[PDB]
Design an enzyme around this catalytic site. Structure first.
Site, PDB file in Angstrom:
ATOM      1  N   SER A 116       0.806  -1.229   0.000  1.00 25.12           N
ATOM      2  CA  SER A 116       0.000   0.000   0.000  1.00 25.12           C
ATOM      3  C   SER A 116       0.854   1.302   0.000  1.00 25.12           C
ATOM      4  CB  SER A 116      -0.980  -0.138   1.180  1.00 25.12           C
ATOM      5  OG  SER A 116      -2.183   0.552   0.954  1.00 25.12           O
ATOM      6  N   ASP A 140      -7.958  -5.130  -7.486  1.00 28.85           N
ATOM      7  CA  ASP A 140      -7.891  -4.021  -6.529  1.00 28.85           C
ATOM      8  C   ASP A 140      -8.776  -2.850  -7.009  1.00 28.85           C
ATOM      9  OD1 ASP A 140      -7.221  -2.186  -4.504  1.00 28.85           O
ATOM     10  OD2 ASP A 140      -5.076  -2.626  -4.614  1.00 28.85           O
ATOM     11  N   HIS A 175      -7.196  -5.314  -2.655  1.00 30.53           N
ATOM     12  CA  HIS A 175      -6.093  -4.566  -2.016  1.00 30.53           C
ATOM     13  C   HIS A 175      -5.322  -5.398  -0.964  1.00 30.53           C
ATOM     14  CE1 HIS A 175      -3.888  -0.936  -1.308  1.00 30.53           C
ATOM     15  NE2 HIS A 175      -4.345  -0.750  -0.083  1.00 30.53           N
TER      16      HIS A 175
HETATM   17  N1  LIG Z   1      -7.461   5.233   2.375  1.00 34.26           N
HETATM   18  C1  LIG Z   1      -6.258   4.746   3.060  1.00 34.26           C
HETATM   19  C2  LIG Z   1      -6.653   4.248   4.460  1.00 34.26           C
HETATM   20  C3  LIG Z   1      -5.466   3.877   5.326  1.00 34.26           C
HETATM   21  O1  LIG Z   1      -4.398   4.450   5.197  1.00 34.26           O
HETATM   22  N2  LIG Z   1      -5.651   2.895   6.216  1.00 34.26           N
HETATM   23  C4  LIG Z   1      -5.652   1.508   5.759  1.00 34.26           C
HETATM   24  C5  LIG Z   1      -6.808   0.778   6.434  1.00 34.26           C
HETATM   25  N3  LIG Z   1      -6.524   0.756   7.887  1.00 34.26           N
HETATM   26  C6  LIG Z   1      -7.253  -0.372   8.557  1.00 34.26           C
HETATM   27  C7  LIG Z   1      -6.653  -1.703   8.220  1.00 34.26           C
HETATM   28  C8  LIG Z   1      -7.444  -2.844   8.380  1.00 34.26           C
HETATM   29  C9  LIG Z   1      -6.942  -4.115   8.081  1.00 34.26           C
HETATM   30  C10 LIG Z   1      -5.635  -4.270   7.617  1.00 34.26           C
HETATM   31  F1  LIG Z   1      -5.154  -5.501   7.330  1.00 34.26           F
HETATM   32  C11 LIG Z   1      -4.834  -3.136   7.459  1.00 34.26           C
HETATM   33  C12 LIG Z   1      -5.335  -1.863   7.760  1.00 34.26           C
HETATM   34  C13 LIG Z   1      -7.288  -0.350  10.050  1.00 34.26           C
HETATM   35  C14 LIG Z   1      -6.133  -0.091  10.800  1.00 34.26           C
HETATM   36  C15 LIG Z   1      -6.184  -0.085  12.199  1.00 34.26           C
HETATM   37  C16 LIG Z   1      -7.382  -0.362  12.858  1.00 34.26           C
HETATM   38  F2  LIG Z   1      -7.426  -0.355  14.197  1.00 34.26           F
HETATM   39  C17 LIG Z   1      -8.534  -0.639  12.119  1.00 34.26           C
HETATM   40  C18 LIG Z   1      -8.487  -0.638  10.720  1.00 34.26           C
HETATM   41  C19 LIG Z   1      -6.758   2.150   8.357  1.00 34.26           C
HETATM   42  C20 LIG Z   1      -5.812   3.149   7.659  1.00 34.26           C
HETATM   43  C21 LIG Z   1      -5.695   3.676   2.160  1.00 34.26           C
HETATM   44  O2  LIG Z   1      -6.155   2.542   2.210  1.00 34.26           O
HETATM   45  N4  LIG Z   1      -4.724   3.968   1.287  1.00 34.26           N
HETATM   46  C22 LIG Z   1      -4.096   2.906   0.503  1.00 34.26           C
HETATM   47  C23 LIG Z   1      -2.929   3.587  -0.147  1.00 34.26           C
HETATM   48  C24 LIG Z   1      -1.908   3.062  -0.925  1.00 34.26           C
HETATM   49  C25 LIG Z   1      -0.929   3.928  -1.415  1.00 34.26           C
HETATM   50  C26 LIG Z   1      -0.970   5.304  -1.138  1.00 34.26           C
HETATM   51  C27 LIG Z   1      -1.992   5.858  -0.355  1.00 34.26           C
HETATM   52  C28 LIG Z   1      -2.974   5.008   0.137  1.00 34.26           C
HETATM   53  C29 LIG Z   1      -4.159   5.299   1.008  1.00 34.26           C
END
Ligand SMILES: N[C@@H](CC(=O)N1CCN(C(c2ccc(F)cc2)c2ccc(F)cc2)CC1)C(=O)N1Cc2ccccc2C1
Ligand SMILES: N[C@@H](CC(=O)N1CCN(C(c2ccc(F)cc2)c2ccc(F)cc2)CC1)C(=O)N1Cc2ccccc2C1
Lengths: 808, 805
Positions: free
Chosen positions: B672, B750, B782
Site C-alpha cells: 500500500s 484491486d 487490495h
Molecule cells: N485510504 C487509506 C486508508 C489507510 O491508510 N488505512 C488503511 C486501512 N486501515 C485499517 C486496516 C485494516 C486491516 C488491515 F489488514 C490493514 C489496515 C485499520 C487499521 C487499524 C485499525 F485499528 C482498524 C483498521 C486504516 C488506515 C488507504 O487505504 N490507502 C491505501 C494507499 C496506498 C498507497 C498510497 C496511499 C494510500 C491510502
C-alpha cells in the site's frame, strides 16, 4: 569443460547489443498508355518515413518511385487511429503508418482511400490525364459524425462510392457531394446489437473477411438507373459480451466486445439487398431495403458463417460461400436479385411481393466441398459469363488444386408465397463436368491474399503454387481449356509473391531467399502469340534491390516415415567440438509455416541476435504446419498441444546428430501466440528436455478462445472433453516445474484476440498449485508488439533470462 | 570476511514447507444486559461475536460469586454463503471495513425488547433475548425485494419496525406483520446516478462512514417515525472500470471513482416520514426535503462526514466538511426545517410559508486548521434542560492534540423568511468551552473509538495515550469538574475496552509485544459517593493465550523529534555477525505499526524472516499516527519527500545500538503506502537499499481519489510540484538499471489502489529501458484474503531475498 558459455553482459550492455542490431512495394495497378513510357505502375510503398501512394514509369535499369500525393500526412497525430480503424489494423496485422489500402477504377482513373479522419481521392490516368508531379489529394466532406470505414467506388458508376458509418451502409456522390444512408440497424452498448454491412469479430479474425458488403458490377434500368449492393445483416444480441481494457490507460475504462466463446452462440446472420435509383444529374431518387422472400435461416438451415460473397461479372447473380458450425461442409450458392423482395412491416404486404416473385427464380447451390478434417476458406472463385467457373479445392484429393466446373441451373419451380422448409439437398445443382486443371502432392495458393488471374482470350489461368517445392512460392501458367502443360514463370532458388497486369503483358515479382534480401522486379511476357502458354518471362526493370549470417534449411524424417523441414541459425564464429546452448523457436500451430526459402532477417532479426551471442537457434515445422496439404494439417484435429512437441523434440535430437554444436542439457523453448502455448506445453510434457520456457500470449484455456478457430480444429467443447482438457495448459499446472527461473510468462494487456485472462488464469492456477513464475506485462500492446521501446525491452529481457537461467 | 551472515539457501519446495510450518477472531462488539433478578446466580449477560470457522453470535454469563463459558445463541446455523462467496454489495462493503472474517460481522440490538437483528446468510435474520439457556433457531425475515438487503437497523422508537437499503433506496418493514414499504425513489449503473440512504465510495473508503441513514430515536404522536438520510447523485463523477471476481466471465464493474481534482457527488440531507396505527400497519409515507436547497444553505460543503439525532428527537445533526478538508462544522437541523417535497411550486410554497421564522440551522461547533481535519467520532449532545445546547466534543485542532471539550453554544433564534429564497455565507455563539483533558498526548476518536458518558455520576470514560503512545489505556474524568484523570487499565499493555450502559463493568481486549492478547472482564467497585475513584477489580476472563517478540526502541532525529521503532533480532544470534536486513514499511498517515501490543498474529512473516536470520527493522517516522497533528502534518503537500529520511535515520541508529545490521544488505518492503515508500526508497536512496519489493503502490497521485489525496496533497491545480515529486511513475529514470532490485506485487481485482498504478509503472519502466520483476494476484483486491496466495506471496518474498539480497 567443452560447454560454450555466453558472455554475461550487464543490463546496459544487453540494451546496447539490441539497440545496435536494429540500427516494400505492394498493391499494384498496371495501367497502359505514344511517348517513351508503355505502362504506369501505381502502388503503395514506404521510402527510406510512412507508406503512401506512389508510381513508376515503365519505359522502353531501375525505376524511380514517383510521389503521387503532394506533402500529404496520411497518418494521424503521432499515429492515433480511431477506435475501429486501429482494430481493423490489428485484424489484418497492419503495423505500418499511412495509406494501408486504396480503391481504384481503371476507366476513370479514380483513387479512393482513408487518411487521418476523412476519406480522400485524386484523379489520374485515362480521360483526366497523367500527372508528372505530386497531386493535391482532395477531401470528401461528410455530415456523418464518426469514422467512415471500408470505402469502395461503385464499379458501374464512378460518381458513386460507399462506406460504413455507425454500423450501417452509406452511399455518397463525389461530384455532387450528396450522401444517403441505406440501412437503419444502428440507432448503444448492449442496447443496439443490430448492424449492417459489417464483418463481425470472428469473421475478421478467423475467416479473413474484412468487408460485409459488395457492389453490383452492373446497373439495370427498371420501368432511372438502379445500383444494387449485397450486404450481410448481423444481430449480435445472444453473443456473450467481454470487457477488454482501453489503450486510454489514464481513462481506466474498457470496451464491450461481442466475443463468441467456443460453444457459445455466433451472431444471427442474413444477406440483404440495398437498391437505389439515380437520374442524369446524379441525384439519388429512391432507396430500398430488400430481403430474401423466405428468411435466410430457413432457406439455408445449418449455415453458421458467411465465409465470402460477391457477384458474377454480368450482375445476373450475387453469390456466397456458406459454412456449417463444425466447418466441414462448405457450399457455393447463387442468389439471383429477383429472389429479394422489399422489406415491409405488414403481413398482408409481404405475401403480395412474394407472390409476385417468379416460380423459376431460386437459390442454385452450385458447388459443395465436404471433408472429415475441416474446410479452409479458399478465396479462388472465378465465374465465366453464360454456369461455368474456376474453383480451388483441397477436400477432393487432400491438396488445394484448381478445378474447372460446369453446374446445371435447372429450375424446379417453387411456391414462393407459402412458407418453405427444404429437404437435405434441395438446391444442389447437377455438376455437368469437373476437370482437374492441376494435380499432385503439392498445393495451389488460395488463402491470405493469394489469387488467380484468368485471361479469357488465351484460355489460360495464372496461379501461384508450391509445385517445385514447399519451401518456395512460384508463378505458374496453365490452360483452363486444355488441362495440360503447366509452365513455371518465376526463377528457381527463391520464393516469389507476384501480381499480374490486367493486360497479361507485364508482371511484378516481390521475391527473396534465406541467404539474399528481398527484390521487386518487373518481368515482361515476351514470345510470339502462336502459343500463349510458352511466353518467356523477359526481365524488364527493377523496383527494388538488396552482422547477419543467414540460417540453413535442412530436413529430416520421423519414425512415422514423413519429411519435416527445419532451420538452423548457426552460432556466429563457431568452434567445432564446443557445445552451445540452444533456443528452440516455436509456433507449431495451423495456418503457419516458418520454414521456407525466403529472407528471415527482417521479422526474425532477434534469432540472428541470439546467434550473434552464441546461441544455437532451431526452427521446426512439425505436423500441423501449413503448406503440406490437408492430412499434414489434420494431424492436430482435436489433439492440440499433444502431437506438436513430439516432433519438436524429434527435430532437436536430429539437429544434435547432423550438426556438431547443440548441448541438449541447455535447451530453451520459446514462441509467441500458439508458440507460447507450445512453450508451456513443452515444459509440461518434456521438462527433461526444456530447462527454461519463455511463453508469450499463450492460450491456456481453450474454452476461453472463440468459435471460429477452436471449433474448426478442436470441435465444440461438449463433443471433445478429453482434448480440451488435455490441451489446456492451465488445467495441468501441477505438471509445471517446482524449480523457479524455468518459466517466464509474457503478455500484452490490451490483447483483444487472446485475452490477458489466459495468463491471468495461468497465474491464478500457478499460485494455487504453489508454483514459481516470472511475468512481464506490456501495458500499451495487444497480441503483437508495435512500439519499438516495448519491443526492445522484450528482446533485452529475453537475452537476460537465457543468460542468467539457461544453465547446466 | 566471515563476519557477513549468509542465510541458508533453500529450494522453492524448502521455502513452501518453511512457510507452511509457520501457520500451525477474538471476542468483540459487546453488549451488557442486566439480569433483573435479585435472588438469581447471574448479575449480567454479555452478548458478543466470535469463533471456535464462522464469526457467530455468542454470549457469556457473569456470576455474582475463572473462565466464562462461550454459550452459543443460534442453533448450529450457517452465516456464510456456500464456498464463502458474498454478493457484490456485501463483498465491496467488507473491503471498505477490511473485514476478512467469515460469517456475522455485525448486529443491531434493542435493549428494551431484547431484539437482535443481523445480516446473515444471503438475507436477514432475528431472535429475541425471557433469558434462554440452550440455543434457538433464528427466524428468517421474508421479503419480495430482488437483490441484497443492506444495512439493517432496528427502529429505536419501535422494535416492531426496521429498515434496509435495496437497490440504493430506503425501505421500511415490520418483523411482526411482515409488511414492507419503500420510502425513497432515487433508483430503478451509469443510467441510474441517484441514490438514497447510501454512503458513496469515498465516504466509505476515506471517511469511515458506511450507513447513509439515521433513525430518529423518538416517535411523535396515529404515531409518526422519522428517518434522516443522505440523498446522493453521482452523474458528474468520473466512471472507471475494475475487473469482476468472475474472471471466467471476463467482465469489469463500473465504479463512481472521483480522481483527485474531479467532482465529488452532489449531496443533501432529507427526511423520510411514515405514520402507523395501534395494529402496526403503515398508514402513509412521505419524502421530505429542506425548505431551502442544500447547496444554498450550507455552501462550500463537500462531504457529509457523520450524522444522527439528539436523544430527545428534537434536532437532527450532521458534521460537514469543505473540499480541502480544513473546515468542519456541526449543524443542528430541526424537522420543522424540512417540508414535503413536490414538483408543484405553489404547493411547496404553501409548506415554505408554513415553516415558522423561528426555525433555523444552528451551526454549533466549527473547527479550523492549516493541516487538515481528521474526522473524529465523538459528539455527545446532552439533553436540553436548564434555548441553549451543552455537548461533549473531541477536538484535535485547538492545541494540535485530540482532547475532550465540554461546550455550551447559544441557540438564539434569528428569524427568517423561508418562502422567499435567500443565500447566506448561522454561526452560534459559544457560551463556554472547557478543556476536560489537555497535554502532549491524545484522546482516541477515529476508527470506532468512542466515549461512554454516565449522566448519573457526571463522568466521561475514554480511551487515550496519556501514559504512552505505545499503549491505549482506559481513563475516566468528570465533565462538571475538569480535574483528575484516573486510569482504569494496568500498564505494560495496550487495551481495547468497552463499557456497560450501567457503568458497573467493562471488558478489555488487551495485549503486549511480549504477550498474546487476553479478553478480561473487570468490575468497578467502591463507594458510590466517590465515583471517579472506583477500583477496577479483575472479575472474570473470557480468553487467555517458534515465536520471538521484537523490542521497541526510541531514538531522536537531527531535528530533535522522538521516533519509535521495532526490531526483530535474528534468531540464535552470534554477536559479531552482520545480518541481512529487511526494513518493513508503511510510512503513510493513519497508521502506527510501532506500539506495545502483540504483533505475532498479523506480522508472523516478520518473525519468519527473523527465524531464517534476517534482521527486520520497523520505524514509525513522521507523518504516522497517534502523535497529534504536528507530527502527522510533516507530510502536508510533500508525500514521498520526508518519509525515507526518518526510515534511513532509524536504520543507521539501529546498526549502532544493535551490532548485527549489515547495512550493505538492506531490503525495503511494504504494501500500500509501504510499497510506495519502497519505490521511493529505491529512487531516493539506492546506495542504502539493494532491493525493493513494492506491493500495491500508488504510482500516480493524480490517479488516486479526492478524499485522501486532497486532504494531504491538496488539489493537483495547487500542488503540481508535490504531486510530480511524489509520483514514483514519473521518476522511473532514477530506478536501477541493475535487474533483481525491484519486485512489483499487485492485486488484479484491486478497486482501492487500482492495478493501473502498477500497469502504468511498468509502462514507464519499459520506456526508460528499466528491468523489473512482477507478480499478479488474480483473485485478490487490495489485501490478500486467500491462504494459498498469501503462502505464494511469502514464498516469493523469501526466495527473492535469498537469491538477490
Ligand atoms: N485510504 C487509506 C486508508 C489507510 O491508510 N488505512 C488503511 C486501512 N486501515 C485499517 C486496516 C485494516 C486491516 C488491515 F489488514 C490493514 C489496515 C485499520 C487499521 C487499524 C485499525 F485499528 C482498524 C483498521 C486504516 C488506515 C488507504 O487505504 N490507502 C491505501 C494507499 C496506498 C498507497 C498510497 C496511499 C494510500 C491510502
Ligand atoms: N486467428 C489466428 C490467426 C493465426 O493463427 N495466424 C497468425 C497470424 N497470421 C498472419 C500474420 C500477421 C502478422 C504477422 F506479423 C505475421 C503473420 C499472417 C500469416 C501469413 C501471412 F502471409 C500473412 C499474415 C495468420 C495466421 C490467431 O490470431 N491466433 C492467435 C493464437 C494464439 C493462441 C492459439 C491460437 C491462435 C490463433
Amino acid at each position: 569443460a567443452a560447454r560454450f558459455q555466453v558472455q554475461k553482459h550487464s543490463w546496459d550492455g544487453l540494451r546496447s547489443i539490441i539497440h545496435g542490431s536494429r540500427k516494400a512495394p505492394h498493391d499494384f495497378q498496371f495501367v497502359q498508355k505514344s511517348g517513351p513510357h508503355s505502362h504506369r505502375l501505381y502502388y503503395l510503398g514506404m521510402p527510406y518515413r510512412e507508406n503512401s501512394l506512389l508510381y513508376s514509369e515503365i519505359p522502353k535499369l531501375l525505376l524511380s518511385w514517383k510521389q503521387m500525393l503532394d506533402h500529404f500526412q496520411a497518418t494521424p497525430h503521432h499515429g492515433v487511429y480511431s477506435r475501429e480503424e486501429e482494430l481493423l489494423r490489428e485484424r489484418k496485422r497492419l503495423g505500418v503508418f499511412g495509406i494501408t489500402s486504396y480503391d481504384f477504377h481503371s476507366e476513370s482513373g479514380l483513387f479512393l482511400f482513408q487518411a487521418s479522419n476523412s476519406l480522400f481521392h485524386c484523379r489520374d490516368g485515362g480521360k483526366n490525364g497523367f500527372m508528372v508531379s505530386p497531386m493535391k489529394p482532395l477531401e470528401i466532406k461528410t455530415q456523418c459524425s464518426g469514422p467512415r470505414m471500408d470505402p469502395k467506388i461503385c464499379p458501374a458508376d464512378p460518381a458513386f462510392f460507399s462506406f460504413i458509418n455507425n454500423s450501417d451502409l452509406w452511399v455518397a456522390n463525389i461530384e455532387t457531394g450528396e450522401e444517403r444512408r441505406l440501412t437503419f440497424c444502428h440507432q448503444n452498448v448492449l442496447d443496439d446489437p443490430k448492424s449492417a454491412g459489417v464483418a463481425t469479430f470472428v469473421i475478421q479474425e478467423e475467416f479473413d473477411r474484412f468487408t460485409g458488403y459488395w457492389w453490383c458490377p452492373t446497373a439495370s434500368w427498371e420501368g432511372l438507373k438502379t445500383l444494387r449492393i449485397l450486404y450481410e445483416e448481423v444481430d449480435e444480441s445472444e453473443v456473450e459480451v467481454i470487457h477488454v481494457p482501453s489503450p486510454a490507460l489514464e481513462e481506466r475504462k474498457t470496451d464491450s466486445y461481442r466475443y463468441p466463446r467456443t460453444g457459445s452462440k455466433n451472431p444471427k446472420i442474413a444477406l440483404k439487398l440495398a437498391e437505389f435509383q439515380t437520374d442524369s444529374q446524379g441525384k439519388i431518387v429512391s432507396t430500398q431495403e430488400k430481403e430474401l422472400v423466405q428468411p435466410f435461416s430457413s432457406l439455408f438451415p445449418k449455415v453458421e458463417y458467411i465465409a465470402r460473397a460477391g457477384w458474377t461479372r454480368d450482375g445476373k447473380y450475387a453469390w456466397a460461400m456458406f459454412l456449417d458450425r463444425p466447418q466441414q461442409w462448405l457450399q457455393l450458392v447463387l442468389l439471383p436479385p429477383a429472389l429479394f423482395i422489399p422489406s415491409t412491416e405488414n403481413e398482408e404486404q409481404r405475401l403480395a411481393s412474394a407472390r409476385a416473385v417468379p416460380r423459376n427464380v431460386q437459390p442454385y447451390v452450385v458447388y459443395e466441398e465436404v471433408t472429415n478434417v475441416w474446410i479452409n476458406v479458399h478465396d479462388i472463385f472465378y465465374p465465366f459469363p453464360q454456369l461455368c467457373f474456376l474453383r480451388a479445392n483441397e477436400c477432393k484429393t487432400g491438396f488445394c488444386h484448381l478445378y474447372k466446373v460446369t453446374a446445371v441451373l435447372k429450375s424446379q419451380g417453387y411456391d414462393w408465397s407459402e412458407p418453405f422448409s427444404p429437404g437435405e439437398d434441395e438446391f444442389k445443382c447437377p455438376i455437368k463436368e469437373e476437370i482437374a486443371l492441376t494435380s499432385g502432392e503439392w498445393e495451389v495458393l488460395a488463402r491470405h491474399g493469394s489469387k488467380i488471374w484468368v485471361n479469357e482470350e488465351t484460355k489460360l489461368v495464372y496461379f501461384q503454387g508450391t509445385k517445385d517445392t514447399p519451401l518456395e512460392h512460384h508463378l505458374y501458367v496453365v490452360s483452363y481449356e486444355a488441362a495440360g502443360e503447366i509452365v513455371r514463370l518465376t526463377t528457381p532458388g527463391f520464393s516469389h509473391s507476384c501480381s499480374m497486369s490486367q493486360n497479361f503483358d507485364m508482371f511484378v515479382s516481390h521475391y527473396s531467399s534465406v541467404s539474399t534480401p528481398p527484390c521487386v522486379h518487373v518481368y515482361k511476357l515476351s514470345g510470339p502469340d502462336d502459343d500463349p502458354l510458352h511466353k518467356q518471362p523477359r526481365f524488364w526493370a527493377s523496383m527494388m534491390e538488396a552482422d547477419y549470417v543467414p540460417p540453413e534449411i535442412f530436413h529430416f524424417h520421423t519414425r512415422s516415415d514423413v519429411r519435416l523441414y527445419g532451420m538452423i541459425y548457426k552460432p556466429h564464429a563457431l568452434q567445432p567440438g564446443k557445445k552451445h546452448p540452444t533456443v528452440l523457436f516455436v509456433y507449431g500451430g495451423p495456418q503457419v509455416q516458418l520454414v521456407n526459402n525466403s529472407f528471415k532477417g527482417i521479422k526474425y532479426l532477434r534469432l540472428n541476435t541470439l546467434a550473434s551471442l552464441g546461441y544455437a537457434v532451431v526452427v521446426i515445422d512439425g505436423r500441423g504446419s501449413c503448406q503440406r496439404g490437408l492430412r499434414f494439417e489434420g494431424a492436430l484435429k482435436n489433439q492440440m498441444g499433444q502431437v506438436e512437441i513430439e516432433d519438436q523434440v524429434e527435430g532437436l535430437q536430429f539437429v544434435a546428430e547432423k550438426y556438431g554444436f547443440i548441448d541438449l542439457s541447455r535447451v530453451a523453448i520459446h514462441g509467441w501466440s500458439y508458440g507460447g502455448f507450445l512453450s508451456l506445453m513443452g515444459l509440461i510434457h518434456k521438462p527433461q528436455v526444456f530447462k527454461v520456457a519463455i511463453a508469450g500470449a499463450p492460450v491456456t484455456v481453450w474454452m476461453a478462445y472463440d468459435t471460429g478457430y477452436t471449433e474448426r480444429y478442436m470441435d465444440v467443447p461438449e463433443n471433445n472433453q478429453h482434448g480440451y482438457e488435455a490441451g489446456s495448459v492451465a488445467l495441468h499446472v501441477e505438471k509445471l516445474p517446482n524449480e523457479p527461473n524455468r518459466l517466464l510468462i509474457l503478455h500484452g494487456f490490451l490483447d483483444e484476440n487472446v485475452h490477458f485472462f489466459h495468463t491471468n488464469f495461468l497465474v491464478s492456477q500457478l499460485i494455487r498449485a504453489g508454483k514459481p513464475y516470472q511475468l512481464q506485462i506490456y501495458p500499451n500492446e495487444r497480441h503483437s508488439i508495435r512500439c519499438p521501446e516495448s519491443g526492445e525491452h522484450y528482446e533485452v529481457t529475453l537475452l537476460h533470462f537465457l543468460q542468467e537461467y539457461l544453465h547446466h
